[PDB]
RNA sequence: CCUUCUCAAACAUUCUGUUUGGUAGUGAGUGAUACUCUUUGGAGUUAACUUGAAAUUGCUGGCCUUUAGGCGAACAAUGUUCUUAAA
């Protein structure tokens, strides 16, 4: 037998948990709602999980939604087995850049590049074809 | 009611649109005001003028205090207003659509025009239009309010409302006085709306407006201006 | 009795159409009959039996203008400019107010004229003209 | 400047590396890398800088692509009005004078209605290599081209100007296409400290001509940006020093 | 059905009135001395005549077919679902012949077939085809497969 | 069920020329050569290939402000509230 936890695939662009909650509440009060999320930049993976208070209400929402044409493409929702539980999702934001200070003073990496350039000359004798510089 | 799963997508994307364009406008106007033009689209602003495909002529903005009359046009198809535009409109009292007001145009007033551009229309009015507007439309705050300000206005020195026309056109002495005195303004809807003959006119002015109003969403959008003499000839 | 119907032959799907009709020429070239109708209209306009639509609109624009072109005492009893008589007006104002409406409008025609500066703004005139129109009708 | 003998040496000996018996096409193509301090504009820069280059590898690209499976194809993107006035033959007669060709012209309307479909849009762009768009339209492209168009160098558009006066003249487009085609090469401007610049397969140009192009590009970039160093290679081969400015590292810290 | 009709409303056929306006326009264009001669592309529109609709089947050319349910001679249409099933045309049973008439400049049509579609709608067409395959062929094939009715009223 | 910044200046007259500035992405996967720095946490970049706007859980960067917003704007900043597209 099934549970009240629900999986929906193929979610529109711009269609976030705030939109999901406001409809699937209309079928009835829901215990939980989440959408699967990317880390570097705030764009959709187009699928999410729901969870209803009552399994029977969860059945009805799945039934009227399993092939829901919407925004120029179809949505597919499926009820989880009784042995299913929500795990490891979080509303990721857009991860902005950082600029951290350079720790070694000037004259140390001054040496490293001369090492690296001279070193990066040495792999070329090792790769390697006759080079002077 | 079960609202829908579709209109939500339209309004969400249209809000992302309005938010990105108003953000771009904020960047550009902040950098211009602070005079930090290193990497931007343009250094000075422009004014567009549509007249009678129809000829569209553009000019550079003049830092001159110019009389204008704002007319609020129905917002885009599926948008809920962002709070910035809401505050600007509430300050200008452009809620309750089909609502206009006279405005002074200076450089400080100017950047907000891009803020509210996709919700209004600008143009250069003539005294005949202004006179028709006031002598045929215009009401003042209810009961003793209307009377008492007329006393304060008299302290400023105005009488015989035709002189309000004269000062609004002249801007010599005190516009904000008369501007606050004409706080509410209202216009009819050009088409009665629902009905067999009327719906044709709704569709026709929808097409005509779609031809006229232009949504740059550039932040260097030239100020769209229309011949208000024709717009009010329709609406008054 | 009744039993469900078996779908034993529908489940087999043919990969080809039934008939190998050769495709006709006319499906790939612009249609000839519309061209013949066009050329019928052409000969008609060449003879002048049909006017061009642009010229027709020109004729309508001229003809609208042409068609629309050719064709073949109580005021002194009433005060209205700093005069005295209306000093009866405020005295029995409650009295005229107490009459019926059809008395009131004529009875509230008369009101004190202060000076040129102020005109109250014609609250009554539109109603009086509407009533006069009904009286005609 | 940069010692040209060193670059000649590098190009000959990369020819040697390649002579040792899609990836097989790939292991012959010339990629400059440039390390430089804070190459960001603090911000994403999809705009392509057009560097002046002595030789035009697009014509060798024609001559080899005729044999290659993928055919070289040119996309121009113009306004509705420009496409209304501009005709294909007016462009073709101008381009046969120097012997090049535009393959198609497309509108923004066309992009947003005909190719508002990720598979069709992706196939349409991937067919092509040179993507030209009016500098006016260029500012509006990104939501239309799709990010996959901007990932690759060929798919991302090149800025080109049709107007010279208030209105545009066919002479301006005619000679600007020449300027972009046979006297300019693209340069993406990503973030970080690392830049990459494309030259092409070794088989197309003279290695000495390769060297002249490399040195002209490198000195232009040095005059442009403070370069930590210039690391040229083939995208299969290991890495090769030619030139480096060491004080740029000090300025990077400070 | 709503998006099916939104798709179709871009592919309304030309009315007799619009046809005659373009005809007189082009005939006037031929009128001038100094006439103009040009070649134009193919038109695009739905197709709707019953024997013509079956004709575009057995080719095949119908990328979509809509079949109205209410036809007083239902035997005119009973074969069409099975025909397109076996042929693999993506048929759909629309409800109401009158609305088909509205989108085709007719009183009623009872059928609405479409074959040729512009590139600007081709992806929409394919995705709608997959959608109708998901909503109709999958859902109701097992209940297409039983006797209906039989309950007294 | 919405539609995408569709141009700015300066110099110059060559019947149009030269220079400068203006572009935040569709998600997922494959993947070469590697580049710098970070101080090991890895971070930003790099060839180019696939895809019916495809679909299953990759755990919580940092700074600043207010009670969500900027880092592509610091006294910078944002919320979902337009009704003759009704009933």
Residue numbers in the entry:
A (entry chain o): 88 to 220
B (entry chain t): 54 to 105, 127 to 214, 227 to 322
C (entry chain s): 239 to 310, 331 to 395
D (entry chain K): 31 to 51, 71 to 303
E (entry chain G): 87 to 239
What do the study's own words say?
Eukaryotic ribosome assembly involves the coordinated activity of more than 200 assembly factors that assist in the formation of small and large ribosomal subunits. Here, we report the cryo-electron microscopy structure of the yeast co-transcriptional large ribosomal subunit assembly intermediate that serves as a checkpoint. The structure provides the mechanistic basis for how quality-control pathways are established through co-transcriptional ribosome assembly factors, that structurally interrogate, remodel and, together with ribosomal proteins, cooperatively stabilize correctly folded pre-ribosomal RNA.
By using the pre-rRNA mimic with MS2 RNA aptamers and tagged Noc1 as baits for affinity purification, we were able to isolate an early co-transcriptional assembly intermediate (hereafter referred to as the Noc1–Noc2 RNP). The resulting composite cryo-EM reconstruction contains domains I and II of the 25S rRNA, the 5.8S rRNA and ITS2. The most prominent feature of this particle is the Noc1–Noc2 complex, which is responsible for remodeling all root helices formed by the 5.8S rRNA and domains I and II of the 25S rRNA (helices 2, 25 and 26). The Noc1–Noc2 complex not only binds to several critical root helices, but specifically encircles helix 2 through molecular shape complementarity in a non-sequence-specific manner. Helix 2 is a crucial root helix of the forming LSU: it contains the 5′ end of the LSU pre-rRNA, and initiates the formation of the polypeptide exit tunnel, one of the essential functional centers of the LSU, which is formed in a tightly controlled manner during subsequent assembly stages in the nucleolus. Further, we observed an unprocessed 5′ end of the LSU pre-rRNA that extends beyond the B1S cleavage site, which later generates the mature 5′ end of the 5.8S rRNA. In conjunction with assembly factors Mak16 and Rrp1, Noc1–Noc2 pre-assembles the highly intertwined rRNA domains I and II, thereby positioning these domains for co-operative stabilization by ribosomal proteins. Key links between domains I and II, such as helix 19, are prevented from establishing contacts, and Noc1 substantially overlaps with domain VI, thereby preventing its incorporation during early co-transcriptional stages of LSU assembly. In accordance with this data, the structure of the Noc1–Noc2 RNP indicates that the assembly of this particle likely serves as a checkpoint because the Noc1–Noc2 dimer interrogates the formation of root helices that form the core of the nascent LSU, encapsulates helix 2 and stabilizes the 5′ end of the 5.8S rRNA. Thus, by various modes of action, including steric hindrance and pre-rRNA remodeling, Noc1–Noc2 serves as a central nexus that stabilizes a co-transcriptional pre-rRNA folding intermediate while delaying subsequent post-transcriptional maturation events until transcription of the entire LSU pre-rRNA is completed.
